[PDB]
Structure 1
Amino acid sequence: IEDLMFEMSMWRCNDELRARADEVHANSRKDAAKHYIEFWKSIPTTEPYRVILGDVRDKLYHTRERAHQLLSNGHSDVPVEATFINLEQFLEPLELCYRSLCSCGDRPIADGSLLDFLRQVSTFGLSLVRLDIRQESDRHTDVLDAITTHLDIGSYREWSEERRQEWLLSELSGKRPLFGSDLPKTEEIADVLDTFHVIAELPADSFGAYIISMATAPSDVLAVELLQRECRVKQPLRVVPLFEKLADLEAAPAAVARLFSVDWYKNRINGKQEVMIGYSDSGKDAGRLSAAWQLYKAQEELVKVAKEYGVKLTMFHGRGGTVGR
């Protein structure tokens, strides 16, 4: 940030950036701010891009500091308002700079360090990569079965796939808390639950997708959606099934089709769905040839299903480094 501030020493800007620059200089905090190396003194409005980038620095410093304490200890006194919480509370000021520079015939300058910085922010965001969370179906099933058994309402394990779909739906559309503090938990049960609580506790742009291994039916996806909502995950992440064994690839288009059939879920999906395709285990229980060919057929029929339901499918290829995977 400090080099960027150094280069952005223009004095011409548009009326928008001038207005905002005056805003920041109004609350510029006329203070020493001696901890900084460069630009330690209050930034004059003579250099407005530097005013704005300077506020970006104070927020970037405080973000790094909140994270550093949160990591070192169990808590931080840094107020979240002093930090970037949004993927683009960061991006807005940089865009304003870009527009202003272009307005004044300084487009080459904007396509210099500022552009590199824009692309870096829009590509890495507040946490370098988005993290995927993966877990096998049977663990979610164990959690739910503990929940229905504790509610003296049956056994989610023993239930037919239809019974599971219907129950999961009714609870998803409902407004009442499911389990409470007193739910009897295996260490595993609490493991999956606690990963959900952890996901809720953290920022959304820090996670990617929830991948379900050994996924067979829509109940498998609806189960994760329900567990997320119930674990007070404010912005739940996308659920995506994994088909890796040859049989699961053969069965994938049907299972995805059955899922998209459920109108409640296809309506909430916002027209986008991701599904993962494992390459490793297919050529291990059947031929390498037959695996590859079934993979091709599966990709083909899945895209057909998605087109049929007007959903843009993106396929996540669990390819390895070796041809055998």
Structure 2
Amino acid sequence: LELCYRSLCSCGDRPIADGSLLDFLRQVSTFGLSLVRLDIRQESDRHTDVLDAITTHLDIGSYREWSEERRQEWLLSELSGKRPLFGSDLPKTEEIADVLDTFHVIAELPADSFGAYIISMATAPSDVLAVELLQRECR
């Protein structure tokens, strides 16, 4: 389309370019391939459950019990690390399976489909860091 617009302007046919073609370019740029971008939203407590089952499965303690700065500390070291965090061998409640599966589906779809991941009931930086970490470790 931009090739058409460029070419048309080249030959002094800009008025033709600024008709149906400009309207089309503007609609492409505004709506893209999806019309809209889906945001995802979930409670912070639902991410806390997932990390708590992870830390329980690794015999490190309960991610729920940790202070906000201990949580911050562990989350930081893990984002700095190079080792994956969990595998299929992981006790998953139905809810935890929902959270991880949502992350996998996000991972399976093109980026132009998604806007923002929104943490309901956010209160502390560890609530954001949890979500970034889950996003990385769900590929």
2:126 equivalent in structure 1: 219
Q: In structure 2, how many angstroms separate the alpha carbons of the residues matched to 1:95 and 1:175?
A: 42
Q: Secondary structure at the match of 2:116?
A: strand
Superposed CA offset, 1:36-60 (max 9, x none): xxxxxxxxxxxxxxxxxxxxxxxxx
* Pair 1:134 & 2:41 matched: yes
Q: In structure 2, how many angstroms separate the alpha carbons of the residues matched to 1:217 and 1:193?
A: 22
Q: In structure 1, how many angstroms separate the alpha carbons of the residues matched to 2:30 and 2:90?
A: 41
Q: Which has the higher helix share?
A: 2
Q: In structure 2, how many angstroms separate the alpha carbons of the residues matched to 1:97 and 1:163?
A: 58
Structure 1 segments, 4+ long, off by >3 Å, are: none
Higher relative contact order (CA 8 A, sep 6+): 2
CA apart distance, 1:95: 1.3
**RMSD of equivalent CA atoms:** 3.3
Q: Secondary structure at the match of 2:135?
A: helix
Q: Secondary structure at the match of 1:132?
A: strand
Within 5 Å, give how 1:47-66 maps onto structure 2: none
Superposed CA offset, 1:48-98 (max 9, x none): xxxxxxxxxxxxxxxxxxxxxxxxxxxxxxxxxxxxxxxxxxxxxx11211
Within 5 Å, give how 1:196-207 maps onto structure 2: 196-207=103-114
Q: Secondary structure at the match of 2:70?
A: helix
Q: In structure 2, how many angstroms separate the alpha carbons of the residues matched to 1:173 and 1:108?
A: 55
Q: In structure 1, how many angstroms separate the alpha carbons of the residues matched to 2:81 and 2:2?
A: 42
Name stretches of at least 5 consecutive residues in structure 1 with no aligned partner.
1-93, 232-324
Superposed CA offset, 1:279-301 (max 9, x none): xxxxxxxxxxxxxxxxxxxxxxx
Name stretches of at least 5 consecutive residues in structure 2 with no aligned partner.
none
CA apart distance, 1:172: 1.1
Q: In structure 1, how many angstroms separate the alpha carbons of the residues matched to 2:15 and 2:61?
A: 68
Taking only the aligned residue pairs, the percentage that are identical comes to 100
Q: In structure 1, how many angstroms separate the alpha carbons of the residues matched to 2:76 and 2:30?
A: 36
Q: In structure 1, how many angstroms separate the alpha carbons of the residues matched to 2:38 and 2:127?
A: 21
Q: Secondary structure at the match of 1:212?
A: strand
What's the TM-score, normalizing by structure 2? 0.97
CA apart distance, 1:99: 1.2
Based on CA coordinates, which of the two structures has the bigger radius of gyration? Answer: 1
2:95 equivalent in structure 1: 188
* Pair 1:229 & 2:113 matched: no
Superposed CA offset, 1:151-195 (max 9, x none): 111110000000111111111121111011111000000001000
CA apart distance, 1:109: 0.8
Q: Secondary structure at the match of 1:175?
A: coil
